[PDB]
Structure 1
Amino acid sequence: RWVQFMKEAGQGSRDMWRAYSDMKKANWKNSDKYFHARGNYDAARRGPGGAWAAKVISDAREAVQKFTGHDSRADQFANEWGRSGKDPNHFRPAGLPKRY
């Protein structure tokens, strides 16, 4: 039912949060696009609910970015890259620890 979709959305949201926290924790220059792609990739592979959550969260982030001044297209490109099932590692900065 809609329950299963929502559970996937819930999982997808956590994948999104996981990507965000791992990115602060890593504090690695030019890592953002990797984590954006990775969070959307992980989330979408939870199923339709996860892919929906990743999009909704990504657009919420874009909206806040716009409001505060900037970039955004590049981020959304990385977002959609991972969400479509493409490898986030194409954005992986050299030396990024294997645990991320």
Structure 2
Amino acid sequence: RWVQFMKEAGQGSRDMWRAYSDMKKANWKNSDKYFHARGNYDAARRGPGGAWAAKVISDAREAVQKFTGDSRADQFANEWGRSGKDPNHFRPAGLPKRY
């Protein structure tokens, strides 16, 4: 169903935004890989529409960052999460458990 796909995409996009926002709040050493994986994991957890949303938002973020005023590691972390593997694989010591 198209409607269900679009619903999941909307939920997933909010998950990706929550990952961004948390990353900015945490302001933490060597956590970028974790939040990349967490955003994608959360979003794909919604279903195909969420996983689709994770993928295109991920690629846009990567693009804009190469429009800069370790991409391969970022994309690896994105897909680690998007495929359902535990984002805490990349968790740095000390990162508050709220994240």
TM-score bin (small chain):
over 0.9
C-alpha displacement of 1:54: 0.2
Where does residue 63 of structure 1 map in the other structure? Answer: 63
Cα root mean square deviation, aligned: 1.0
- TM superposition score normalised by structure 1: 0.95
User: How many pairs are equivalent?
Assistant: 99
Deviations 1:26-80 (CA, angstroms, capped at 9, x unpaired): 11111110000000000001000000000000000111122227x1111000000
Aligned-residue identity in percent:
100
| Structure 1 runs of 4+ with >3 Å offset | none
Q: In structure 2, the residue corresponding to 1:40 is in which secondary structure?
A: helix
Q: What TM-score, normalized to structure 2?
A: 0.96
Structure 1, unaligned stretches of length 5 or more?
A: none
Cα distance, 1:89 vs structure 2? 0.3
Return the alpha-carbon distance in structure 1 between the equivalents of residues 14 and 92 of structure 2: 23
Residue number in structure 2 paired with 1:18: 18
2-side partners of 1:94 and 1:67: how far apart? 31
Q: How does 1:1-100 map to 2 (within 5 A)?
A: 1-68=1-68, 71-100=70-99
